[PDB]
Amino acid sequence: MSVSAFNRRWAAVILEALTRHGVRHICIAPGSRSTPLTLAAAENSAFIHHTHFDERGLGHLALGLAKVSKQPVAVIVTSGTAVANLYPALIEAGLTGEKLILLTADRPPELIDCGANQAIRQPGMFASHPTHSISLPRPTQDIPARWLVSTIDHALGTLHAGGVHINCPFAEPLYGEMDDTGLSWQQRLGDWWQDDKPWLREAPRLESEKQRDWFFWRQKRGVVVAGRMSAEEGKKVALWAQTLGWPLIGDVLSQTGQPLPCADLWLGNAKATSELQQAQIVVQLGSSLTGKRLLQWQASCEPEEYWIVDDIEGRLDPAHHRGRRLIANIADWLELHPAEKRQPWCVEIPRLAEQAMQAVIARRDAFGEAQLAHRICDYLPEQGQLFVGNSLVVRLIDALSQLPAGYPVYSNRGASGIDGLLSTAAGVQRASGKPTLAIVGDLSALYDLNALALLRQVSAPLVLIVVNNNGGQIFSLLPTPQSERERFYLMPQNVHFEHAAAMFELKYHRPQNWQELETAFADAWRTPTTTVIEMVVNDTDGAQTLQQLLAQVSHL
Amino acid sequence: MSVSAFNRRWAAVILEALTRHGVRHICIAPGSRSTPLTLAAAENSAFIHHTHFDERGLGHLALGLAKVSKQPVAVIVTSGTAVANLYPALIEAGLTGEKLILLTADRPPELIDCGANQAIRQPGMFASHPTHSISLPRPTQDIPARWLVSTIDHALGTLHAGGVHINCPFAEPLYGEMDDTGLSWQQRLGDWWQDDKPWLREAPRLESEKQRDWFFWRQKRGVVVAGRMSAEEGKKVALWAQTLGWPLIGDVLSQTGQPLPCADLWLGNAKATSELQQAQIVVQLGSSLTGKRLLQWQASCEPEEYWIVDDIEGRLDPAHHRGRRLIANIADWLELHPAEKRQPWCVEIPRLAEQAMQAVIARRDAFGEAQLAHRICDYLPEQGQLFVGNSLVVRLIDALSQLPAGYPVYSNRGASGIDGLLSTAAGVQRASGKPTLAIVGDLSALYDLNALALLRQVSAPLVLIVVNNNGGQIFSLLPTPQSERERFYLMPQNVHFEHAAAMFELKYHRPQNWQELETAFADAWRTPTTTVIEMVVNDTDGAQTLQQLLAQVSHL
Numbered sequence A, B: 001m002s003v004s005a006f007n008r009r010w011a012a013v014i015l016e017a018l019t020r021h022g023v024r025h026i027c028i029a030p031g032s033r034s035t036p037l038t039l040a041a042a043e044n045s046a047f048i049h050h051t052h053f054d055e056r057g058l059g060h061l062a063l064g065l066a067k068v069s070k071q072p073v074a075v076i077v078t079s080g081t082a083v084a085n086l087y088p089a090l091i092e093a094g095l096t097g098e099k100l101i102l103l104t105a106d107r108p109p110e111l112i113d114c115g116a117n118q119a120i121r122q123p124g125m126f127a128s129h130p131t132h133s134i135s136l137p138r139p140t141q142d143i144p145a146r147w148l149v150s151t152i153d154h155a156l157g158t159l160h161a162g163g164v165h166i167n168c169p170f171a172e173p174l175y176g177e178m179d180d181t182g183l184s185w186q187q188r189l190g191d192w193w194q195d196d197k198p199w200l201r202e203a204p205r206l207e208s209e210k211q212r213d214w215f216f217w218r219q220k221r222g223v224v225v226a227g228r229m230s231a232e233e234g235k236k237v238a239l240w241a242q243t244l245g246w247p248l249i250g251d252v253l254s255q256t257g258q259p260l261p262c263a264d265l266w267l268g269n270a271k272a273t274s275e276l277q278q279a280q281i282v283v284q285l286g287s288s289l290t291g292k293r294l295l296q297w298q299a300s301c302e303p304e305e306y307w308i309v310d311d312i313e314g315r316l317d318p319a320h321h322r323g324r325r326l327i328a329n330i331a332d333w334l335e336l337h338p339a340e341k342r343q344p345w346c347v348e349i350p351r352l353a354e355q356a357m358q359a360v361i362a363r364r365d366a367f368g369e370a371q372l373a374h375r376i377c378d379y380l381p382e383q384g385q386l387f388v389g390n391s392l393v394v395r396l397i398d399a400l401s402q403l404p405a406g407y408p409v410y411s412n413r414g415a416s417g418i419d420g421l422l423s424t425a426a427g428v429q430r431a432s433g434k435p436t437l438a439i440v441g442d443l444s445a446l447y448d449l450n451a452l453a454l455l456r457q458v459s460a461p462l463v464l465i466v467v468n469n470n471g472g473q474i475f476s477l478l479p480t481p482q483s484e485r486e487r488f489y490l491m492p493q494n495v496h497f498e499h500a501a502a503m504f505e506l507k508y509h510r511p512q513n514w515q516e517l518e519t520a521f522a523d524a525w526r527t528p529t530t531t532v533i534e535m536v537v538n539d540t541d542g543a544q545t546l547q548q549l550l551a552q553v554s555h556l
């Protein structure tokens, strides 16, 4: 009889099913049409609930939670442009593998395409970007609960990576006291309600087989390239490459300790590129390589075979080398393809890389963004994690710093958007509970400015460094035309972030020299709150510093 | 030979063709992949250029420009999540008819699905929401310039309303010096470059035919409902209805002058609906009706025929009445179906409407949001325009105020998103150059908070009133369950907007009483700048006032 009651019973099945697949964090934005989903989630004690008013931010908060915890994270939004706002986070999840479960409330079919308020066409809205799309029917008892839980069990069970869009139509009335309507319909699931398993267990694993000729290839002159991977995997890749005697080119996202640091610099040296030409095989573990010189070297290297090992699917080599694309957990893959101790074949590169670090160290004194990135190791929170933003900061750190082996780094380097970095960082912190250092540019912070509301709640100290060089100065680094650069590229906004911090009652510092930067950190790490540290620097110094070091190191 | 130069010639054709279809405003966000488009736009003198760092805000800025100018507005963004951020404005445009031309730069096909940075699958990404989608091929001279301009001319030429997605892949290099490459390719268009018309003129008109039985129907007992329409059309509808002797139920968006004001209250009176049961025909002009009582009356009324006249396509009656759905310019439609002077047939409703307004007037004194809405007609800037936000404020003004006929009102009541109101308002101002009054809630303001960046540049005074009732109090109006209401619906953020105004150097007022509010207004209209006025009010006072007034009038 009661439509509102059945809606919530219908919804309760969906949310309880999710808990059988390890969903613990759920991010909720406010709405009315989402009432059945939101009320079922609120009443279910298995969940940790997060809220936000900005659905674009909500998406990235969830992206952050899934990024660190490696479990699927659910999102609830109401119908309309609220759903559309989940698109950036969904597209990023599609690239880097985070499991986002988007539960999008909808008008029922009779309120579609008839000029009803807050009614849009939602099925298929995200095109091909979700891993799996479910368009749920108009709730009705004539469809049994076992069908509904199975549909969800299928989507979550077979989810190797990426997002699941579950569109959820609900007809009014949405509110009203609880009736018995739908109760017996639910009870057709029996003691599944007391169980901890899915109704339907469908969980095939996707993995490449062992390469039987590995023991043949590990004898050749090889190069190891390490991109984004877990902290423990980075440590393991360093030992593995060192044992093999192959040079290790380590991205800032690899957490390998970068035993050959400043690769973006020494790879620019002809002696380095000449020596790497003797490489017969390249084994790349991880992907989304950061540095330009590395991308250029990868694009041009012509080994007999090119392998990329990663747990995400699809092609990952933008140069399309002859070789192999191996789907596996990186740590698992290393145990299956073990190193055996062999004499190092590189002699020139270890010298060049050390000279390269030396040239950077010689310029460490100036109070600029290049120097911050170079020295950032000195500022990492103990037993914490680094969240690196996009544009210059991730590049300067890749090229100029040597990050410690196994110290956790997180990022949004799938599509490399600057639209969710503060809110993503909030999720990265909440997932692990660790003290967090997050570094972003001035435009990035403006972009996700209202996410400072989320940073009012962290479980441990989070230092947010906003590097303010007045615009997107990455476009001072690229060869953009001078006449239009300022108006159409840099887009300086001429702001500071003191009032932003005060509005959300966050501590704020604007250090003028290294001593004052060091004082600000000492203060910030004392409490489980977010501290904003704004570093004001001359617009083009970072880019020019990077360019000069490249030129200097290439002539060594 | 030169790839960078041809990229620019190819784009030059794209942007020049748009100028032939009335495109004058172009909104640009920063990026590298967009270089051919952005440099092509910057060098074309036909355009007025606006910039912004937030692509979501950018989209809404364009939406506002198009909303007021009723001309197509172009948008240029770089590849990636930048593209996704345009979705909210595009969906809205698809519902209310704004013509947005989205030029979304893309990676070339050989860099799709292979792990390249910032490259995602962009074709078809907006699903069915653009009116038309163009997926441009990889730029090449082997495809004639006349094909490219013809492609754009077909799309803009046949564009009745809504958005066009033009995906524009470009291969690197993007930079370099301008070459001769592509010159003759362009010159194949001959003196089209000096012309002012499209290469291909395809502009069929879509319009309903004259209703041959209008002389029969206009003599019946009719009801006129006015939804959203232009300011001039509103005055014309008022005269039209008044001549017919038909009661006019005028929405806050109609600008008809609302001769039977407070319809949201008196429609709740059983005597009014009893009289309306005599109506044999309903003629509605415009759509997106605001009030709950009007939507409920529409749903339950049963005239022999229900007509909806509007210039946008598709069904607009969420109640699906037997009747007609007529596509036409409303003013054109009125001249084709003129009124005949006839005796008004309604007797009970004019009394009720007057008593209803009396009841609202009796409560005008309290310093609350409900009184603000009621009194807003007293604060409209002379020769200016009102941008009204979503949630409560548009409902309170609809229920409690009587706006003057022909006074321009703008809104986002397509999808009713709270995600782009500040940036839309900025666009609404820049298009007309008129003094603007914009009113939004605290969460709406937080949502589009970085759009304050845009509000630093207006051509005339813009007053932004932020009603701060600490959360989304529309969920205090709706029968949401109290236990979860605060955390999961209202979501109070406990902030103020003084520091936000300070961050962007906007003057700020927080009035304590009507005198201080009128003082704030007097100050603001004096300079071509944005003034922020934050009205702090008791959380639930507005919702309850509305609920009490509804109760009172229903008992009259």
Ligand SMILES: Cc1ncc(C[n+]2c([C@@H](O)CCC(=O)O)sc(CCOP(=O)(O)OP(=O)(O)O)c2C)c(N)n1
Pocket: A390, A391, A392, A393, A416, A417, A418, A419, A440, A441, A442, A443, A444, A445, A469, A471, A472, A473, A474, A475, B030, B031, B032, B055, B078, B080, B081, B082, B117, B118
């Ligand atoms: C949502 C969206 N829309 C537009 C862009 C384009 N985009 C970039 C990509 O080119 C960066 C590729 C990368 O990092 O790998 S960087 C950039 C400016 C950032 O300025 P900043 O924060 O002040 O930092 P700074 O440059 O160090 O001074 C933009 C606007 C984007 N990425 N995402």
Ligand SMILES: Cc1ncc(C[n+]2c([C@@H](O)CCC(=O)O)sc(CCOP(=O)(O)OP(=O)(O)O)c2C)c(N)n1
Pocket: A030, A031, A032, A055, A078, A080, A081, A082, A117, A118, B390, B391, B392, B393, B415, B416, B417, B418, B419, B440, B441, B442, B443, B444, B445, B469, B471, B472, B473, B474, B475
């Ligand atoms: C992008 C998006 N996401 C979520 C929503 C849902 N939604 C609403 C729709 O229900 C309003 C339909 C309508 O206006 O008719 S209103 C609302 C809260 C607004 O709070 P406020 O600005 O502080 O003002 P106040 O509530 O009057 O106190 C939300 C969160 C949305 N519309 N769009």
Ligand SMILES: [Mn+2]
Pocket: A441, A442, A443, A467, A468, A469, A470, A471, A472, A473
């Ligand atoms: Mn910057």
Ligand SMILES: [Mn+2]
Pocket: B441, B442, B443, B467, B468, B469, B470, B471, B472, B473
């Ligand atoms: Mn509010």
